[PDB]
Coordinates of C-alpha atoms in Angstrom, one line a residue:
Chain A
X1 CA -0.2 0.1 -0.1
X2 CA 2.3 3.0 1.3
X3 CA 5.2 0.5 -0.3
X4 CA 5.9 0.3 -3.9
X5 CA 7.7 3.0 -3.5
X6 CA 8.3 3.4 0.2
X7 CA 11.9 5.5 0.4
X8 CA 13.6 6.5 2.7
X9 CA 11.1 8.0 5.6
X10 CA 8.6 6.0 6.9
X11 CA 7.8 2.7 5.4
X12 CA 5.2 0.8 7.1
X13 CA 3.4 -2.5 6.1
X14 CA 0.1 -2.4 3.9
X15 CA -3.6 -1.6 4.4
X16 CA -2.8 1.9 5.5
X17 CA -5.2 4.3 3.5
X18 CA -8.6 5.5 3.5
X19 CA -10.9 2.9 1.5
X20 CA -14.6 4.2 0.4
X21 CA -17.6 1.7 1.1
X22 CA -20.1 3.1 -1.5
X23 CA -21.1 1.1 -4.6
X24 CA -21.0 2.0 -8.7
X25 CA -23.3 -0.3 -11.2
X26 CA -22.3 -1.3 -14.7
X27 CA -24.9 -2.7 -17.9
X28 CA -28.0 -3.8 -17.5
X29 CA -30.6 -5.5 -19.9
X30 CA -33.7 -3.5 -20.2
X31 CA -37.0 -5.2 -19.3
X32 CA -39.1 -5.6 -22.5
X33 CA -40.9 -9.0 -21.7
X34 CA -42.0 -8.7 -18.1
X35 CA -43.8 -6.1 -18.0
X36 CA -45.7 -5.9 -21.2
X37 CA -48.2 -8.4 -21.1
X38 CA -52.0 -8.1 -19.7
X39 CA -51.8 -9.8 -16.3
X40 CA -54.9 -12.5 -15.6
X41 CA -55.9 -12.8 -12.5
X42 CA -57.5 -16.4 -11.2
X43 CA -58.2 -17.6 -8.2
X44 CA -57.3 -21.6 -9.1
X45 CA -54.4 -24.0 -9.9
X46 CA -56.2 -24.4 -13.7
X47 CA -58.5 -22.1 -15.7
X48 CA -60.6 -23.5 -18.6
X49 CA -63.1 -22.2 -21.5
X50 CA -64.7 -23.4 -25.0
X51 CA -63.8 -21.8 -28.0
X52 CA -65.7 -22.3 -31.6
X53 CA -63.7 -23.5 -34.8
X54 CA -64.4 -21.9 -38.0
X55 CA -66.5 -23.0 -41.3
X56 CA -69.1 -24.5 -41.5
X57 CA -70.2 -24.4 -45.2
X58 CA -72.9 -24.8 -47.2
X59 CA -73.2 -26.3 -50.5
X60 CA -75.4 -25.4 -53.4
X61 CA -78.3 -27.1 -55.0
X62 CA -77.4 -29.1 -58.1
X63 CA -79.3 -26.8 -60.2
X64 CA -82.1 -29.3 -60.8
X65 CA -82.6 -31.1 -57.2
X66 CA -85.1 -28.1 -55.8
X67 CA -87.6 -29.9 -54.4
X68 CA -87.9 -32.6 -51.5
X69 CA -85.3 -34.5 -52.7
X70 CA -83.0 -33.8 -49.1
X71 CA -79.0 -34.5 -49.8
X72 CA -77.8 -30.2 -49.2
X73 CA -75.2 -31.4 -47.1
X74 CA -75.2 -29.8 -43.4
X75 CA -72.1 -27.7 -41.3
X76 CA -70.2 -28.9 -38.5
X77 CA -71.7 -31.5 -35.9
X78 CA -68.9 -31.7 -33.2
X79 CA -67.9 -28.4 -32.5
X80 CA -66.3 -26.0 -29.0
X81 CA -62.6 -27.3 -28.7
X82 CA -61.6 -26.4 -25.0
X83 CA -58.3 -24.6 -24.5
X84 CA -56.9 -25.3 -20.8
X85 CA -54.4 -22.8 -19.4
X86 CA -51.8 -24.4 -16.6
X87 CA -50.1 -22.5 -14.0
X88 CA -46.3 -22.9 -13.1
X89 CA -44.4 -21.8 -10.1
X90 CA -41.1 -21.0 -8.7
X91 CA -39.5 -20.2 -5.6
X92 CA -35.8 -18.6 -4.4
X93 CA -34.2 -18.4 -0.7
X94 CA -31.3 -17.1 0.7
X95 CA -30.1 -17.0 4.6
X96 CA -27.6 -14.9 6.3
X97 CA -25.7 -15.6 9.6
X98 CA -24.5 -13.3 12.1
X99 CA -21.2 -14.8 11.9
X100 CA -20.5 -12.9 8.6
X101 CA -22.4 -9.4 9.3
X102 CA -20.7 -8.9 12.5
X103 CA -16.9 -9.0 11.5
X104 CA -17.6 -6.8 8.2
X105 CA -19.0 -3.1 8.0
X106 CA -23.0 -3.0 8.9
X107 CA -24.3 -2.7 5.3
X108 CA -25.2 -6.2 3.4
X109 CA -28.8 -6.1 4.8
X110 CA -30.7 -3.8 2.2
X111 CA -28.0 -4.9 -0.9
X112 CA -29.5 -8.6 -0.5
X113 CA -33.1 -8.2 -1.0
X114 CA -31.9 -5.5 -4.1
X115 CA -30.0 -8.6 -5.7
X116 CA -32.5 -11.1 -5.4
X117 CA -35.1 -9.6 -7.0
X118 CA -33.2 -8.9 -9.8
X119 CA -32.0 -12.4 -10.0
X120 CA -35.4 -13.2 -10.0
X121 CA -36.2 -10.5 -12.7
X122 CA -33.4 -11.9 -14.7
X123 CA -34.7 -15.3 -14.3
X124 CA -38.2 -14.9 -15.5
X125 CA -37.5 -12.7 -18.3
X126 CA -34.7 -15.3 -19.8
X127 CA -38.0 -17.8 -18.9
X128 CA -40.4 -16.2 -21.2
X129 CA -38.1 -16.0 -24.2
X130 CA -36.1 -18.8 -23.9
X131 CA -37.7 -22.0 -22.2
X132 CA -38.5 -25.9 -22.7
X133 CA -41.4 -27.7 -21.6
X134 CA -40.9 -29.5 -18.3
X135 CA -40.7 -28.1 -14.9
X136 CA -40.6 -24.9 -16.6
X137 CA -42.6 -23.3 -19.4
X138 CA -42.1 -23.2 -23.1
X139 CA -40.2 -19.6 -24.2
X140 CA -41.3 -17.3 -26.9
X141 CA -37.9 -18.1 -29.3
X142 CA -39.0 -21.9 -29.3
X143 CA -42.9 -21.0 -29.3
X144 CA -42.4 -20.7 -33.1
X145 CA -41.0 -24.1 -33.6
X146 CA -44.2 -26.4 -33.3
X147 CA -46.2 -24.7 -36.0
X148 CA -43.6 -24.5 -38.6
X149 CA -43.3 -20.2 -38.3
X150 CA -39.8 -21.0 -39.2
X151 CA -38.1 -19.9 -42.4
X152 CA -34.4 -20.6 -43.9
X153 CA -32.4 -18.5 -44.3
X154 CA -32.2 -14.3 -44.2
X155 CA -28.3 -13.6 -43.6
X156 CA -25.1 -15.1 -43.9
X157 CA -23.6 -16.7 -40.2
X158 CA -20.7 -14.2 -39.9
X159 CA -19.9 -14.4 -43.9
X160 CA -20.9 -10.8 -45.1
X161 CA -23.8 -10.6 -43.0
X162 CA -26.6 -7.5 -43.5
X163 CA -30.1 -7.5 -42.2
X164 CA -31.8 -5.2 -44.8
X165 CA -35.3 -4.1 -44.7
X166 CA -36.8 -7.1 -47.3
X167 CA -35.9 -9.5 -44.5
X168 CA -38.8 -8.2 -42.5
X169 CA -41.1 -8.4 -45.5
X170 CA -40.1 -11.9 -46.8
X171 CA -40.7 -13.1 -42.6
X172 CA -44.7 -11.1 -42.8
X173 CA -45.2 -13.3 -46.2
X174 CA -43.7 -16.4 -44.2
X175 CA -46.4 -15.7 -41.5
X176 CA -49.4 -14.7 -43.9
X177 CA -52.3 -15.4 -41.8
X178 CA -54.8 -13.6 -40.8
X179 CA -54.7 -9.8 -39.9
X180 CA -52.2 -8.0 -42.2
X181 CA -53.8 -4.5 -41.0
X182 CA -51.1 -4.1 -38.2
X183 CA -52.8 -5.3 -34.9
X184 CA -50.1 -3.7 -33.1
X185 CA -47.2 -6.5 -33.6
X186 CA -44.2 -6.7 -30.7
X187 CA -40.9 -7.4 -32.3
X188 CA -38.0 -8.1 -30.3
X189 CA -34.2 -8.0 -32.0
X190 CA -30.6 -9.1 -31.0
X191 CA -28.2 -6.2 -30.0
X192 CA -25.7 -7.6 -32.7
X193 CA -28.7 -7.9 -35.4
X194 CA -30.0 -3.8 -33.9
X195 CA -25.9 -2.9 -34.4
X196 CA -25.7 -4.9 -38.0
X197 CA -28.8 -2.5 -39.5
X198 CA -27.1 0.9 -39.6
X199 CA -24.9 -0.3 -41.7
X200 CA -27.7 -0.1 -44.8
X201 CA -28.0 1.0 -47.6
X202 CA -31.4 0.0 -47.5
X203 CA -34.6 1.7 -47.1
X204 CA -33.6 4.3 -44.2
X205 CA -29.9 4.4 -45.7
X206 CA -27.7 7.6 -45.4
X207 CA -29.2 9.5 -48.1
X208 CA -32.4 11.1 -49.3
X209 CA -33.5 9.0 -52.2
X210 CA -34.4 6.4 -49.5
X211 CA -36.1 7.7 -46.4
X212 CA -38.1 10.5 -45.8
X213 CA -37.0 12.4 -42.7
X214 CA -37.1 10.0 -39.7
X215 CA -33.8 10.3 -38.1
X216 CA -34.0 13.2 -36.4
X217 CA -31.3 13.3 -34.8
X218 CA -29.2 10.8 -36.8
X219 CA -29.4 7.0 -37.1
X220 CA -32.3 6.6 -34.3
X221 CA -34.1 3.0 -34.1
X222 CA -37.2 3.3 -36.4
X223 CA -37.8 0.2 -39.0
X224 CA -40.7 0.3 -41.3
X225 CA -43.0 2.9 -39.1
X226 CA -42.9 0.9 -36.0
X227 CA -40.5 1.8 -33.4
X228 CA -38.2 -1.5 -32.7
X229 CA -37.5 -3.2 -29.2
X230 CA -33.6 -4.7 -28.6
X231 CA -32.6 -7.3 -26.1
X232 CA -29.2 -8.6 -25.0
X233 CA -31.3 -11.9 -24.1
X234 CA -30.3 -13.7 -27.5
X235 CA -28.1 -16.8 -28.0
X236 CA -24.5 -15.7 -29.3
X237 CA -24.4 -15.9 -33.1
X238 CA -24.6 -18.9 -34.8
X239 CA -27.8 -20.8 -36.3
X240 CA -30.5 -19.4 -34.0
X241 CA -33.0 -16.2 -33.5
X242 CA -31.8 -13.0 -34.1
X243 CA -35.3 -11.5 -34.8
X244 CA -38.7 -12.3 -33.1
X245 CA -42.1 -11.2 -33.8
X246 CA -45.8 -11.8 -32.2
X247 CA -49.0 -10.6 -33.1
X248 CA -50.7 -9.0 -29.7
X249 CA -54.3 -8.4 -30.0
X250 CA -56.2 -11.5 -27.9
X251 CA -52.7 -13.0 -27.0
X252 CA -49.8 -13.3 -24.8
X253 CA -51.4 -13.1 -21.6
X254 CA -49.9 -14.2 -18.3
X255 CA -51.7 -15.9 -15.6
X256 CA -51.2 -15.0 -11.5
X257 CA -52.4 -16.0 -8.5
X258 CA -50.7 -13.7 -6.3
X259 CA -47.9 -10.9 -6.6
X260 CA -44.3 -11.2 -5.6
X261 CA -44.3 -11.5 -1.7
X262 CA -41.1 -11.5 0.2
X263 CA -40.5 -12.5 3.6
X264 CA -38.2 -13.9 6.4
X265 CA -37.8 -16.6 9.1
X266 CA -35.2 -17.1 11.9
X267 CA -37.6 -19.0 14.4
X268 CA -37.6 -21.8 15.5
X269 CA -34.0 -21.9 13.4
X270 CA -30.7 -21.2 14.7
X271 CA -28.8 -18.1 14.4
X272 CA -29.8 -17.2 11.0
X273 CA -32.1 -14.7 9.5
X274 CA -33.4 -16.3 6.2
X275 CA -35.1 -14.5 3.4
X276 CA -37.8 -16.5 1.2
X277 CA -39.6 -15.5 -1.8
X278 CA -42.0 -17.1 -4.2
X279 CA -43.7 -17.0 -7.7
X280 CA -46.5 -18.6 -9.6
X281 CA -46.5 -16.7 -13.0
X282 CA -46.2 -18.0 -16.2
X283 CA -46.5 -17.2 -20.2
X284 CA -49.2 -19.1 -22.5
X285 CA -51.1 -18.7 -26.3
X286 CA -54.9 -19.4 -26.8
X287 CA -54.1 -20.1 -30.5
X288 CA -51.4 -21.5 -31.8
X289 CA -50.6 -18.5 -34.5
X290 CA -49.4 -15.5 -35.0
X291 CA -45.7 -15.8 -34.1
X292 CA -42.4 -16.4 -36.0
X293 CA -38.3 -16.5 -35.3
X294 CA -35.9 -15.5 -38.2
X295 CA -33.6 -17.4 -38.4
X296 CA -30.9 -16.9 -39.3
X297 CA -29.8 -20.4 -40.2
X298 CA -27.0 -20.8 -42.5
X299 CA -26.1 -19.6 -46.2
Chain B
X1 CA -52.2 -11.7 -69.1
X2 CA -49.7 -14.1 -68.9
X3 CA -46.7 -14.3 -67.7
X4 CA -45.5 -11.1 -65.0
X5 CA -43.5 -13.5 -62.6
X6 CA -43.4 -17.4 -62.2
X7 CA -45.2 -18.0 -59.1
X8 CA -42.7 -17.0 -56.3
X9 CA -39.8 -18.7 -57.9
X10 CA -37.9 -16.7 -59.2
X11 CA -39.0 -12.8 -59.3
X12 CA -42.2 -11.1 -57.5
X13 CA -45.3 -8.8 -58.2
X14 CA -44.6 -5.9 -60.1
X15 CA -46.6 -2.4 -60.1
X16 CA -47.2 -2.4 -64.1
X17 CA -49.0 -5.1 -63.8
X18 CA -51.9 -2.9 -63.1
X19 CA -50.7 -0.3 -65.7
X20 CA -50.9 -3.5 -68.6
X21 CA -54.1 -4.9 -66.8
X22 CA -56.1 -1.1 -66.9
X23 CA -54.3 -1.0 -70.7
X24 CA -56.7 -4.5 -71.5
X25 CA -59.6 -4.1 -69.3
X26 CA -62.5 -2.5 -71.4
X27 CA -60.8 -0.2 -73.9
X28 CA -63.1 3.1 -73.0
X29 CA -63.7 1.6 -69.5
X30 CA -62.0 4.5 -67.6
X31 CA -63.5 7.9 -65.9
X32 CA -60.3 8.8 -63.5
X33 CA -60.9 5.8 -61.1
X34 CA -64.2 4.4 -59.9
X35 CA -62.6 0.8 -60.6
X36 CA -62.1 -1.7 -58.1
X37 CA -58.6 -4.0 -57.7
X38 CA -59.2 -6.8 -55.5
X39 CA -55.5 -8.4 -54.2
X40 CA -54.7 -11.7 -53.0
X41 CA -52.9 -11.8 -49.6
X42 CA -50.0 -13.5 -51.1
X43 CA -49.4 -10.6 -53.8
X44 CA -50.2 -7.8 -51.4
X45 CA -47.0 -9.0 -49.4
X46 CA -44.5 -9.1 -52.0
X47 CA -45.4 -5.8 -53.1
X48 CA -44.7 -4.1 -50.0
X49 CA -41.1 -5.1 -50.1
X50 CA -41.0 -2.4 -53.1
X51 CA -38.6 -1.0 -54.8
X52 CA -41.3 0.7 -56.8
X53 CA -43.1 4.0 -56.8
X54 CA -45.3 3.6 -54.9
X55 CA -43.4 2.6 -51.5
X56 CA -43.4 3.5 -48.0
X57 CA -40.1 5.5 -48.0
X58 CA -40.1 8.8 -50.5
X59 CA -39.8 7.1 -54.2
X60 CA -43.2 8.3 -55.1
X61 CA -45.6 8.2 -52.5
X62 CA -48.0 10.4 -51.1
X63 CA -46.0 10.5 -47.6
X64 CA -47.5 7.7 -46.2
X65 CA -45.3 6.1 -43.1
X66 CA -48.3 5.7 -41.4
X67 CA -49.8 3.7 -42.1
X68 CA -48.1 0.1 -43.9
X69 CA -49.4 1.0 -47.5
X70 CA -52.1 3.4 -49.1
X71 CA -54.7 2.9 -51.5
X72 CA -53.2 4.8 -54.3
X73 CA -52.3 2.1 -56.9
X74 CA -53.1 4.1 -59.8
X75 CA -55.7 5.9 -58.1
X76 CA -57.5 2.8 -57.2
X77 CA -58.3 1.2 -54.0
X78 CA -56.8 -2.1 -52.6
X79 CA -59.4 -4.4 -51.3
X80 CA -57.7 -7.6 -49.6
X81 CA -59.1 -11.0 -50.5
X82 CA -57.8 -14.3 -48.7
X83 CA -59.5 -16.9 -50.7
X84 CA -57.0 -18.1 -53.9
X85 CA -56.5 -21.5 -54.5
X86 CA -53.0 -22.8 -55.3
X87 CA -50.1 -20.9 -56.6
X88 CA -49.0 -21.8 -60.0
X89 CA -51.5 -20.6 -63.3
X90 CA -54.2 -19.0 -61.2
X91 CA -55.6 -15.6 -60.7
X92 CA -54.4 -13.3 -57.9
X93 CA -55.8 -9.8 -59.1
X94 CA -59.4 -9.1 -59.8
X95 CA -60.2 -5.4 -61.5
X96 CA -64.2 -5.0 -61.5
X97 CA -66.4 -2.0 -61.9
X98 CA -69.6 -0.7 -60.8
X99 CA -70.9 1.9 -62.9
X100 CA -73.5 0.2 -65.0
Chain C
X1 CA -18.6 -3.2 -6.6
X2 CA -21.6 -5.3 -6.9
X3 CA -21.8 -8.2 -8.8
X4 CA -23.8 -9.8 -11.9
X5 CA -26.4 -12.4 -12.0
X6 CA -27.9 -14.3 -10.5
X7 CA -30.4 -17.2 -11.3
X8 CA -33.1 -19.0 -10.0
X9 CA -35.1 -22.3 -10.8
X10 CA -38.2 -24.2 -11.0
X11 CA -40.1 -26.6 -9.2
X12 CA -40.3 -30.3 -10.1
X13 CA -43.9 -29.6 -9.7
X14 CA -44.9 -32.3 -7.9
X15 CA -42.9 -31.9 -4.7
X16 CA -44.1 -30.6 -1.5
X17 CA -41.9 -31.7 0.5
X18 CA -39.9 -28.7 1.4
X19 CA -37.9 -29.3 -0.5
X20 CA -37.1 -25.7 -1.2
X21 CA -35.8 -26.7 -4.9
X22 CA -34.0 -23.5 -4.7
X23 CA -30.4 -24.9 -5.9
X24 CA -28.7 -22.1 -3.5
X25 CA -27.6 -18.6 -4.5
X26 CA -24.4 -16.8 -4.2
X27 CA -25.2 -14.8 -0.8
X28 CA -22.7 -11.7 -0.4
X29 CA -19.3 -12.4 -2.6
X30 CA -18.5 -9.6 -4.5
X31 CA -15.3 -8.3 -6.0
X32 CA -12.9 -4.7 -5.3
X33 CA -10.9 -2.5 -7.6
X34 CA -8.5 0.2 -6.1
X35 CA -7.2 3.3 -7.5
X36 CA -3.6 4.2 -8.4
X37 CA -1.7 7.4 -8.6
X38 CA 1.4 8.4 -10.8
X39 CA 3.4 12.0 -10.4
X40 CA 4.9 14.2 -13.3
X41 CA 6.9 17.0 -12.1
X42 CA 9.3 19.1 -14.6
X43 CA 12.4 21.1 -13.4
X44 CA 14.5 24.2 -15.5
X45 CA 17.0 26.5 -14.6
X46 CA 18.6 29.8 -15.2
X47 CA 22.0 31.4 -14.6
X48 CA 22.4 35.1 -13.2
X49 CA 24.7 36.1 -16.4
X50 CA 21.7 35.9 -18.9
Chain D
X1 CA -11.4 -3.5 -36.2
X2 CA -10.2 -4.6 -39.7
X3 CA -10.2 -3.1 -42.9
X4 CA -11.6 -0.2 -43.9
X5 CA -8.8 1.7 -45.5
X6 CA -5.3 0.7 -46.7
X7 CA -2.7 3.7 -46.3
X8 CA -5.1 5.8 -47.9
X9 CA -3.9 6.6 -51.2
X10 CA -7.0 4.9 -53.3
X11 CA -8.7 3.8 -50.4
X12 CA -10.0 6.8 -47.9
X13 CA -12.0 7.1 -44.8
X14 CA -15.9 7.5 -45.5
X15 CA -18.9 7.7 -42.9
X16 CA -19.9 4.3 -42.4
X17 CA -16.8 2.9 -41.2
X18 CA -18.3 4.5 -37.4
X19 CA -21.3 2.3 -38.0
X20 CA -19.7 -1.2 -38.1
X21 CA -16.6 -0.4 -35.4
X22 CA -19.2 0.6 -32.4
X23 CA -20.4 -3.1 -33.0
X24 CA -19.5 -3.8 -29.0
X25 CA -19.6 -0.6 -27.5
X26 CA -22.3 2.6 -27.2
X27 CA -25.6 3.1 -29.1
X28 CA -27.4 1.2 -27.0
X29 CA -24.4 -0.3 -25.5
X30 CA -24.7 -0.6 -21.2
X31 CA -27.6 2.1 -21.5
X32 CA -26.4 5.6 -22.9
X33 CA -27.7 6.5 -26.2
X34 CA -24.4 9.3 -25.9
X35 CA -20.2 9.2 -26.9
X36 CA -17.7 11.3 -27.8
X37 CA -15.6 11.0 -31.1
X38 CA -12.2 12.2 -31.6
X39 CA -10.7 11.9 -35.1
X40 CA -7.1 12.9 -36.6
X41 CA -6.1 16.6 -37.8
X42 CA -5.1 15.1 -41.0
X43 CA -7.9 11.9 -41.5
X44 CA -10.3 15.2 -41.3
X45 CA -9.5 16.6 -44.5
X46 CA -9.9 12.8 -46.0
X47 CA -13.6 13.1 -44.8
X48 CA -14.4 15.4 -48.0
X49 CA -14.5 13.5 -50.8
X50 CA -17.6 10.9 -49.4

């Protein structure tokens, strides 16, 4: 400490300097899936409802068979498909002991509560984007894997990549069904794909041959009329999803039976104060439609 | 008209289909707009990555941005329809009239 | 300086024996940083004769 | 980052370089849409032919 160099007067040893108890904070993700989707309150464990199917056609007369003379066809004899909403649960805990706060500084208590809620917030946010099926629900990026929503290919997997405006048009051509009239769709793009989008040279280029005045004040996040949402929760460059687009009009609702409760026990414990927190919020779709992910495979 | 493109398979729709359809339609059939253009759901999508004059940027539009394409296609309104069958030798447009 | 994430996990669905299913989390292990400072100095001279 | 220009001459530095260059830093980066840019005195007189 006062060493290196200590010459020639007082040398002493090391710890001979004032320390500062202040903290600072680097990067964060900005939270865009955990606060964008309608809460459904419910008092049970599973919620059920029926929904109609479509056509339901009626046949025309054979231009001779007008009388009785039966034969006219009929519509859909069995109907009213049920839909079930399951609910999934999670928990966390953190336990402190007296022996690690007495020889310290008397400041670790409020910081722990801030950290566990952020760790919970990171964990739910990744699960909603990326998730499997067993124990924890399936996530948004692999939501578009079971309905055949996918495409091959968009950009070129790190050999002259570009993410040009015709990508999103081809992506909506691939989704197609059933509402082209802009029902407030939500689109989320990768960190790198967001950065690559400003090399273009397409639609919103560096000249006024393409875009009208829309940047304002210089290369801002505006695509095809809509703003664009960016996230750092995409997996590193490979054959995965860099762009996800979902319809938001009836769907992407989250059922929940409580809000966040955070509590503490220490009786009849020995020593420790132990914090507990529990949750029950998950993601589902009513209808298997309106979801696409690019992908971005290889070229 | 037979044939502009080839069923997605290397070149898509182009804004000069509508001029050719209007040219062959009914000779004396004009009198400004007052003509109805029905467009397939498919055909509406590939005319939206343009690259043509009726764009959503600035190339030759009425300043559309806001919304996601507008009914200005040679002065005709755009009517969507999703009821169209196999994409091979089929019709994707209908130009029809309602003045008589 | 306070540390990075921070991951929780989800129950085995059936379990209800407490059995908290939480993994465990990294209580209060963090990292320090330090600042070190260099000295810049000059000296120059002049003679009585000029 | 490698490469744009190769010793000026016949390949000069144009304004697209700062698009690919910031693919790991700021705008968005950590959370802040602000940066400060410093350029060479001679390179400043290259940025006139674009």
